[PDB]
Design a protein around this ligand. Structure first.
Ligand SMILES: Cc1c(C2CCCC2)nc(N(C)C(C)C)c(-c2nnn[nH]2)c1-c1ccccc1
Ligand SMILES: [Cl-]
Length: 134
């Protein structure tokens, strides 16, 4: 048993607040924002030993990251940013920091009731996206 077991499973988007705003703060273009904002992504989270995999499937884009907690990795995001990423587990919350071009954004995932709640922060903007088991 792993702490990340709380996160393992297939998760579907059920609500979103301020995602367009968050995407604007990152400099995401209009067409990507419109189509991605519309989409209904699922996330499959799996653990295999020390390696955690987060795989996104949608009609917009499919993406995958695999990582070990605390070990920096190069990530190319869905909006084509080339970032240095580090993901850690802090007091039960998966905390993902991305660094690029002297900027930073933090993505936090936490379990709340039967939900997986994603809090995205860029500069002053917080977006909350809520996911439930598929
Ligand atoms: C385009 C996109 C983005 C980019 C815009 C902001 C930075 C990258 N970030 C996402 N999440 C929430 C994280 C990684 C920030 C998601 C996403 N939403 N749920 N899972 N992934 C999506 C998304 C993918 C496919 C279908 C719809 C939306
Ligand atoms: Cl997620």
């Amino acid at each position: 048993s792993h702490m990340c077991d709380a996160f393992v499973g297939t998760w579907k988007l059920v609500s979103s607040e301020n995602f367009d705003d968050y995407m604007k703060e990152l400099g995401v273009g209009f067409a990507t924002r419109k189509v991605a904002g519309m989409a209904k992504p699922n996330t499959i989270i799996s653990v295999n030993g020390d390696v955690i995999t987060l795989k996104t499937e949608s009609t917009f884009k499919n993406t995958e990251i695999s990582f070990i907690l605390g070990q920096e990795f190069d990530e190319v995001t869905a909006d084509d940013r080339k970032v240095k990423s580090t993901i850690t587990l802090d007091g039960g919350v998966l905390v993902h920091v991305q660094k690029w071009d002297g900027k930073s954004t933090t993505l936090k995932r936490k379990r709340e009731d039967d939900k997986l709640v994603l809090e995205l922060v860029m500069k002053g903007v917080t977006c909350t996206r809520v996911y439930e088991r598929a």
